Design a protein around this ligand. Sequence first.
Ligand code: NI
Length: 341
Amino acid sequence: TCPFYKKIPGTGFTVDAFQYGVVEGCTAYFLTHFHSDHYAGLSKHFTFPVYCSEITGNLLKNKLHVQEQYIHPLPLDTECIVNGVKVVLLDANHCPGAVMILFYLPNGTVILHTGDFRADPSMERSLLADQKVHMLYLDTTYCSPEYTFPSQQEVIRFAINTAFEAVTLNPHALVVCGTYSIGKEKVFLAIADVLGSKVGMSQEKYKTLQCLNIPEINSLITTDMCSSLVHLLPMMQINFKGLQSHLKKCGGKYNQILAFRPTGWTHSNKFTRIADVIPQTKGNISIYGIPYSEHSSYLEMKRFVQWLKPQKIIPTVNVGTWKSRSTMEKYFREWKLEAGY
Ligand code: NI
């Protein structure tokens, strides 16, 4: 049944709650972003109103065939009224179209649901700064101090310089980037731009990217693989077998593959600087695991919460074990005591 941390008290609302059938007393279903653990359950047969960003609504219509009459896109950074309740959608710094939702309850309580987010100081100057938040439903994916990772900018620098060096040494090398969901588009787009290439991909992935309002996209992506030296493949195919096979498919146009797996975190991070990352190599194939995260590090999450000073925190991730839950609650108390709220 629908868990409590997906229900917004004092409203008829649920968030990311599409896999439970008809939720009792839900008048409006919010969707924070287009990732499968969150949208699981939506299809063309859904007939309740869905509230979401413009980008998320493009993906619902084109990829899942949800009928347009049930899709209610809202502009960001704008006060809107839904079933008599004031709401605002804020950029979540997650994947394209990902939002946080501010709810202004009729009794005066204010609730922020972060969806999935990567906290950033820029958030401290949105409409969040303008009022107090009583309850926070928090993306706690990496709520433990061992989770450090570099900025997204440093990781893109590393990838660009690595790709550019490899292809300038060998003009017959192919660069491959793994994907399984929207998000992390900067990785493959930054590499293609430095190589003066388009990014080649399957028709299904090209379709997905055409839903995202990325400026100048027709200039950066293509379904003609042959004309491209950056290819996108399913994350599952980024291993020595899958890449040896793909290399056969290019008809002797290429004699080397350099491939990137954008992982979230990997325990190489507890010991290693980004500068120090090395690939796994077999023959003429090398695979780099790079720590490109679209979730908060532990320090970024702590800073955001100590800035916000919520009266109550409700975790939405890692809530399935008592040891996880107890750990997170200990960190929330530390943060509150250190900051003085
Ligand atoms: Ni997500």
